[PDB]
Design a protein around this ligand. Structure first.
Ligand SMILES: Nc1nc2c(ncn2[C@@H]2O[C@H](COP(=O)(O)OP(=O)(O)O)[C@@H](O)[C@H]2O)c(=O)[nH]1
Ligand SMILES: Nc1nc2c(ncn2[C@@H]2O[C@H](COP(=O)(O)OP(=O)(O)O)[C@@H](O)[C@H]2O)c(=O)[nH]1
Ligand SMILES: [Mg+2]
Ligand SMILES: [Mg+2]
Lengths: 295, 326
């Protein structure tokens, strides 16, 4: 029937729903296209599906030729959201997007959720993503970094040899950033904040004293975006169904920076593994091969 | 020789700057830096030994927690209530800036601050007591800056009628582990013969975002507290017995779930917008919270070793307790 999220890895053990994954990734019109994988990952109830909903609105507006909407319009769209399932979900619709110059690529949206058996699934989405958007609340804590270090090392260990770096882009997405008078919302404030915050954390906690070097050894690019609070109506509703105008002004403004920064055709980076670009079919094969290693 | 009238005038401007420079504000009474703990006895005695309050039994309301969690904001509303009670809607009028004596106007300092003005309130039945407001602040982020935050947190717990443990959004394992530590460090100095070491503990949870799970306020906080504790015990063995530990140190444990105050408060370093610019539900819940702590029938005299303590006795405990941690 309608598009929606598909449970592809489910969590004490884990399983790949290969038939569910393959029915998405093996469709005739995207099967041999190079795939761009955008992955949002983090703990339960941190607003991952809300941000994925705006990614979809951008993708569907681009597909159907202001993507955010009129203020008076309810958010009225296919939405990503017990939701307390540990595992990986992928959007059932793969988007075909033409890059400048004419190359058409497939765009997959991925959601990784968990609270450690979750090391496997965070590793898997890291290994299979063009951009891993690590979704944190308010600040970057020692435990956020300890976990990040663990699942990136765990993913790197399932990849036998690495002539380059194992992963591509890491983005720290900091939600409900409350100190724009110290670091401005968005990318440049986020960059200045990340490096200072990592330096402070490394010096406070010997368990992550090399996390900066480790992260940089793992990822070819590391960025950070400071996102404003979305307003009390979004924050206190189990399932926000209000209108665009009921979302805080600055959140919407920063959405207009963040979302195209990730999804504009000229920002889409094809997934690479072993120094070669990966098709949708190849993605399916890698999910199968990695799942086998972790089992 | 200056004129008589000019002499009294110059003395008059002298007493004008005297009152202005000593206007009611926060007083740093216990300070840390570098480690080691210093107690400004002269400053503390000037507060607690004022003639009219020296021998009254004392009610000590303490707000405690990590930096930048809105402790001084909540203290400012407590002051508004107490100044209202003193000589007279205590919250203010909607179109007016939040005005009054403020706390953050008078800091990354680790230690304890006490409001310089002691309030005398008449309880139901006519007993007048002294009310002291205390602000306790420090980081427990790292391995360093954790021994010293335990000490000052123990100190304000030992000396308070109610310890308002001010936490953001939820009760986390690290909040419970530090609580366990500083109530342990404070327990030792108590003799524990006639009474539990401490009186009331209140988990004040700020920016509660789940009223459809547990309602804002006291009844929601109590339904939330016990079930939250059982979870954290099961997950981190270091606090596996924290609920029994809490109930052995305190004679009362409560929890209050407080709304978010609005984006204007949240993103301004020192909010000076209008009362109307504070979230409506926040103000509603404040009208429950602040009287629940400060209404005359709720003021609990400080008790140590089975006996009610006076302001002057409170000074002597601070001087004695501080030497123990040395
Ligand atoms: N404070 C805050 N709440 C949000 C944000 N985004 C979504 N929410 C709310 O937080 C709750 C959890 O959101 P959800 O998207 O389901 O989180 P997920 O479990 O990570 O997918 C819902 O009530 C959302 O309305 C945000 O940026 N900040
Ligand atoms: N999100 C949120 N912010 C608050 C709250 N109360 C105060 N603030 C803001 O948080 C920041 C720190 O508040 P402050 O009272 O100085 O924190 P303190 O260091 O614990 O005294 C200020 O910008 C306040 O305006 C609250 O309940 N929730
Ligand atoms: Mg989700
Ligand atoms: Mg303070």
């Amino acid at each position: 029937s309608k598009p929606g999220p598909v449970q592809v890895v489910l969590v004490h053990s884990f399983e790949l729903d290969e038939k569910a994954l393959a029915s998405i990734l093996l469709q005739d019109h995207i099967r041999d296209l190079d795939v761009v994988v955008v992955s949002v990952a983090g703990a339960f109830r941190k607003g991952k599906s809300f941000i994925l909903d705006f990614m979809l609105r951008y993708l569907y507006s681009q597909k159907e030729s202001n993507w955010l909407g009129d203020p008076e319009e309810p958010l009225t769209g296919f939405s990503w959201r017990d939701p307390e399932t540990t595992g990986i979900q992928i959007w059932s619709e793969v988007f075909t997007v033409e890059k400048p110059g004419g190359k058409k690529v497939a765009v997959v949206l991925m959601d990784t959720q968990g609270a450690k058996d979750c090391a496997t699934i965070f590793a898997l989405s890291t290994m299979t993503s063009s951009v891993q958007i690590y979704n944190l609340s308010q600040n970057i804590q020692e435990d956020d970094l300890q976990q990040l270090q663990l699942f990136t090392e765990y993913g790197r260990l399932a990849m036998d040899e690495i002539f380059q770096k194992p992963f591509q882009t890491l983005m720290f997405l900091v939600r409900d950033w409350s100190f724009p008078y110290e670091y401005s919302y968005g990318l440049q404030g986020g960059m200045a904040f990340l490096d200072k915050r990592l330096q402070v954390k490394e010096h406070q906690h010997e368990e992550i004293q090399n996390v900066r070097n480790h992260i940089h050894s793992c990822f070819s690019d590391v960025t950070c975006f400071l996102l404003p609070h979305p307003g009390l109506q979004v924050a206190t509703s189990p399932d926000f169904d209000g209108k665009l105008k009921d979302i805080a002004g600055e959140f919407k403004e920063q959405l207009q920076a963040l979302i195209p920064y990730v999804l504009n055709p000229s920002k889409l980076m094809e997934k690479e593994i072993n120094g070669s670009k990966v098709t949708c079919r190849g993605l399916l094969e890698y999910f199968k091969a990695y799942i086998k290693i972790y089992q």
